[PDB]
């Protein structure tokens, strides 16, 4: 229900939480043929079968991806300039597919 | 205090040290091995990458 959902929100309307109570795996975003790009920088690429978190995502949405080279950290373009500002204190990892 | 003698004015390049090894070393042993350290996944037949 989280990754195969129907319709997206606005880009600025997200959930201020992190995932909870789960067998974190990192496996599907690498091995599934639907996924192409997944770059984790500050965290090891296989490090969720021991890592662990507190609050809880329910990010259940899918959106058109025709803005590939602008939906990325530290970028400018037609999307993350107004109506949604990327923070100075972003901490996390990005999937692209 | 010895900044002046074992230091070339154009650079002393003849002193080496090991920065990569699969295992921590033993007290007062001598390792002369020059095998290429394995960091990633695929091996080399004498190439880079």
């Amino acid at each position: 229900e989280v990754f195969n959902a129907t319709r997206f929100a606005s880009v600025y309307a997200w959930n201020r939480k992190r995932i909870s109570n789960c067998v974190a795996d990192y496996s599907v975003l690498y091995n599934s043929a639907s996924f192409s790009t997944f770059k984790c920088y500050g965290v090891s690429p296989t490090k969720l079968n021991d890592l662990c978190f507190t609050n809880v995502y329910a990010d259940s949405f899918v959106i058109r991806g025709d803005e590939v080279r602008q939906i990325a950290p530290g970028q400018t373009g037609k999307i993350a300039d107004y109506n949604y500002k990327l923070p100075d204190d972003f901490t996390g990892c990005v999937i692209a597919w | 205090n010895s900044n002046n003698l074992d230091s070339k004015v154009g650079g002393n390049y003849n002193y080496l040290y090991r920065l990569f090894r699969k295992s921590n070393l033993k007290p007062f042993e001598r390792d002369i091995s020059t095998e290429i350290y394995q960091a990633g996944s695929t091996p080399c037949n004498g190439v880079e990458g």
Partner: antibody
Amino acid sequence: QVQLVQSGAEVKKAGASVKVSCKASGYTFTSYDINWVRQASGQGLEWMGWMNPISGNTGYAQKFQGRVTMTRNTSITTAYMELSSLRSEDTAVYFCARGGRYCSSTTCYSGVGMDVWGQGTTVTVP
Amino acid sequence: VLTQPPSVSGAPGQRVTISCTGSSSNIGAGYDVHWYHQLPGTAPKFLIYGNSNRPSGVPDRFSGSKSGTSASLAITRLQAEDEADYYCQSYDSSLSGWVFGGGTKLTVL
């Protein structure tokens, strides 16, 4: 703190060989992965050889295989890419390369040639 | 080798993008792709390494990403002050260490 000097404009003949040097001295060479990329007149750049400046780890180009010899002088901090068996179609403009990536890390990152060597051409005309 | 739009024209304005297309073994591991800035009259000091990270010499106009089987870039307006040939340097792993591409020249009108 990067200094990079190649040879000058020359002229050679087919069947000969050039023992070309690509000279630098005066910083920590061990931290960098020295590449070797050439170019052509009006055509793109293509890479030939690579250098780990410690103990001379060796790798050759497939396009210029059997006619290439790679050697270095770590005593004077010098690397060679000896272009052996010069040809008739050798008429082009070649370059060295160098890395500036800090290769004390395990990852095979791209070499940061934020300086590139000067100028060279192994032209062979009659 | 790797296909890309080789010659362009531009004046200042709003963003324009580039790609550099490789195969699956080339585009899969070749995320170290970057573009040799060969400006007229200087050494090929590339001004872009490892996509989005830079040495000194360019503003934040240029973007770095990977696009399926294509190694992609996004300018904020390919324009009249940026005369420079580019290439694409993908770390090809099982193939040669890095094989270059079509050679998109960022150029002027």
